[PDB]
Structure formats: structure tokens, C-alpha cells
Amino acid sequence: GQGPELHLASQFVNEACRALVFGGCVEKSSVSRNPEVPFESSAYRISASARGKELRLILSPLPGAQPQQEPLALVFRFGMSGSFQLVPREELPRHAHLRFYTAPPGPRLALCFVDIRRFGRWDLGGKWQPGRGPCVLQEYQQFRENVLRNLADKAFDRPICEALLDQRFFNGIGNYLRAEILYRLKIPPFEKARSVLEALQPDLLELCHSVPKEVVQLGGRGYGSESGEEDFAAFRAWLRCYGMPGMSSLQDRHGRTIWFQGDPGPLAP
DNA sequence: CGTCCAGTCTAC
DNA sequence: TAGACCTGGACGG
Numbered sequence: 001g002q003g004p005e006l007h008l009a010s011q012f013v014n015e016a017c018r019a020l021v022f023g024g025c026v027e028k029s030s031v032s033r034n035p036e037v038p039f040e041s042s043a044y045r046i047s048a049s050a051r052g053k054e055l056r057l058i059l060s061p062l063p064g065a066q067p068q069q070e071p072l073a074l075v076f077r078f079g080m081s082g083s084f085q086l087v088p089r090e091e092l093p094r095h096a097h098l099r100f101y102t103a104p105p106g107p108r109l110a111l112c113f114v115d116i117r118r119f120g121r122w123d124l125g126g127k128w129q130p131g132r133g134p135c136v137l138q139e140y141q142q143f144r145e146n147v148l149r150n151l152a153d154k155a156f157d158r159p160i161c162e163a164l165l166d167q168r169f170f171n172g173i174g175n176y177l178r179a180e181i182l183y184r185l186k187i188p189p190f191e192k193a194r195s196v197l198e199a200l201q202p203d204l205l206e207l208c209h210s211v212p213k214e215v216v217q218l219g220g221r222g223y224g225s226e227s228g229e230e231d232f233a234a235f236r237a238w239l240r241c242y243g244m245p246g247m248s249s250l251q252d253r254h255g256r257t258i259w260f261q262g263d264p265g266p267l268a269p
Numbered sequence: 270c271g272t273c274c275a276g277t278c279t280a281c
Numbered sequence: 282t283a284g285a286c287c288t289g290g291a292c293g294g
Contacts, residue, residue, distance in 0.1 A: 002276095053276080079276055081288080095288080117287040119276060165276080174276070253282080256276085272293080278285085 001078050003137050003172025004215030004222035006050040009084045012226065013048035013057065016086045017111060021062065022046055023103030032097040034122050039072045041065045046100055046111060051135040052171025053077060055084075056126050059100075073126020079119020085112050085226060098122065129167075136172040137216065140209040143171070148201050156194040159267040160204075161258040163193035170208055176223060176242040177215075179259035181207045183241035188265025189250070189258045214238065 001009070022044045026037035043062040048055055059072040076082065085093060089101060089108035096112035097120070113120065134142035147169050150156075155166050164170050164178040173181070182189050184207050187196055196204055215222045218238060220231025241247055242259045249257050250269060 077277075079286090081275085115287095116289070117275090119278095119286065121277085167277085254276095255283090257274090270294085272291105274291085275289095276286105279283105280285095281283085 001053075001082065001223055002174035002177055003050070003052055003135070003212045004177075005224055006053055006055050006078060006172070007137055007212075007216055008221050008224070009078075009082075009226075010048040010050035010055050012086075012221075013046060013055075013084055013111065017046045020045070020106075020109065020111075021103045022059075022100045022111070024101050026059070027099045027101070029095075029097045032118065034097070034120075035124055037072070037074065037098070037122075037124070039069065040067055041069050042067075043103060044069075051128055051138065052132055053167060053174065054128055054132065054171075056128075058126065072124075074122050074124065075126060075128060076113060076122045077120055077129075079115065079117060079121070081114075081116040082120035083114040083224070083226060085114050086110075087112060132167050132171045133169050134171060136170060136208045137212055143208070144205045147197060147205055151194050151197055151201070156192075156197060158193055159190040159252065159265065160187060160193045160196050161189035161260075162252050162254070164208075165252075165254075165256065172212060173208060175256055175258075176239065177208075177212055179242040180240060181211050183259075183261060184211065186262065188263040188268075189252075189260045190265030190268040192267060 023042050025040050028036055039059055041061040043065040045060045047058045055076045057074045061069045087110055089110050093114050095116045096114050098113040100111040102109040133146045136143050161178055164173050218234050220234055221227045225232040247259050249259050252258055
């Protein structure tokens with residue numbers, strides 16, 4: 001997913017796992033090329049936070065748990081189909097690539113990273129990807145400064161629709177959000193990035209925060225349906241531009257589809 | 270059947 | 282930059 005989905009998944013893990021105790025090893029599916037998580041505890045709690053298009057899990061063993069184990073942090077990226085689900089241990093979804101198992105007492109559940117297409121990745125260590133900019137949701141002011149301070153970067157030579165996907169400057173912005181953000185201001189997607197950003201040193205950088213914040217405020221699971229069909233309908237109904245009838249579409253330089261109304265902009269193919 | 274469509278990562 | 286990495290749903294013949 002994108003910022004909203006990573007943020008809501010994070011909120012999901014914290015609520016679902018608040019009163020759960022995990023035990024044992026962390027199991028990876030045999031087909032997954034991500035690394036084995038070397039971690040075992042008779043009794044540990046799981047928590048989460050999001051930053052842009054990444055989510056950090058913390059595995060925190062209870063007082064006196066065995067084996068001797070310090071807390072462990074994993075950072076996840078979701079690629080095109082990543083997701084977290086809490087399921088019954090015997091009813092694992094089809095592409096559950098990493099699993100944390102509840103300990104007795106109560107019914108035996110699995111917290112699962114589910115990723116159909118396996119573009120998602122996880123790293124040992126809890127470090128954010130170096131080079132990703134601050135979170136458009138949780139680090140707005142730092143994110144804003146990081147863009148205005150670096151408009152000289154050749155990243156801003158590109159059309160604004162391409163620039164908005166560069167995770168060094170818009171960590172959390174993906175394909176639906178660039179369409180919804182540029183539609184709110186009727187900025188041609190192939191206006192030059194530097195041209196639209198120089199003019200501001202509710203604007204484009206403010207909406208990079210407020211638009212995805214709207215997806216989060218729906219409750220539900222953004223571009224997702226872990227919360228039901230109702231919350232997915234609510235998301236489709238919030239969209240004004242992305243995939244919507246009557247809207248134009250072009251391929252950017254990297255073959256990604258940009259949705260917009262009216263003027264393509266000067267740098268259009 | 271078949272084609273086409275839905276965010277990094279890295280080899281040229 | 283262009284292709285690689287994947288699975289499944291939508292749609293066409």
C-alpha cells in the first residue's frame with residue numbers, strides 16, 4: 001500500500017495485539033526470499049509504528065521469558081500487495097509469508113504478513129531505509145523542509161507527477177495519492193516539479209499531508225478490505241480522480257499510470 | 270485459452 | 282532508463 005495503508009496496518013497490529021501474548025519462533029514461508037527472523041521467546045508482545053511507506057514491528061519479550069532475548073525490530077515494505085492479518089493458527093491465508101503465533105491461554109491465532117505478489121521485503125534491524133525522506137503523515141514539518149531545502153536536486157527537473165513518487169522527498173506518496181493530490185489543485189501532472197514547488201518558498205506540500213490524512217480518518221484500511229467490504233466502498237467513494245470515469249490517464253516515464261482532469265502539462269509525452 | 274493491468278530494485 | 286520481480290482478477294476470443 002501507501003502511507004495510509006502502512007499507517008492503518010500499524011494501528012491494526014497495535015489494537016489487535018494489545019491483549020495478546022506471542023510465543024515460540026517467527027516462521028517464514030519456504031517460498032519467501034526475505035531473511036529468517038532469528039527470534040524465540042516463551043512470551044512476547046508485538047507493537048508497530050509507520051513511517052511513510054515502511055512499518056516497524058517491535059518484538060518485546062515479557063519479564064522472565066525464555067530464552068534470553070532482547071527486543072527485536074523488523075522494518076517491512078509492502079510492495080504492491082503487502083498486508084497484516086490476525087487469523088486462526090490453522091486458517092493461515094494463502095500467501096502468509098511471515099507468522100507470529102499467540103501463546104496459550106485463549107484461542108491459537110497467527111499475526112501474518114500476507115503478500116500475494118511478494119514485492120514486499122523485510123530487514124533485520126529496526127532502521128528506516130536511509131535515503132527515504134520524513135513521513136508525510138507523521139513528520140509533516142520535517143518533510144516540508146526536506147523538499148523546500150533541496151529544490152536544486154535533479155529529482156525536481158522531472159514532471160511533478162514523477163517527483164511525487166520519489167520516496168526521498170515524498171515518503172508515503174504512491175499512485176492513487178499523486179492523482180488525488182494534483183486533482184485537488186488542478187495542477188497539470190506534467191508541470192515541472194521545481195516550477196510548482198519554487199512558487200511556495202492550502203498548497204501542494206500541505207495536501208501531501210492532508211489528503212492521505214483523509215484516507216486514515218475514514219477508519220477502515222484505505223486501498224484495502226481487511227476491515228470489511230463497507231470500508232473498501234468508503235475508500236472508492238472518497239476517490240475523486242484515480243480510476244474515475246471521465247478522467248484522463250497517461251503513462252509517466254516509468255510506465256506508471258497518472259490520472260488527471262484537463263491539461264496534461266508542458267512535459268507530457 | 271490468451272492479454273493486460275494493479276513499488277521498489279538493480280543491471281545496463 | 283528498461284526489465285525483473287510475482288499472482289490473480291477482468292476481459293476478450
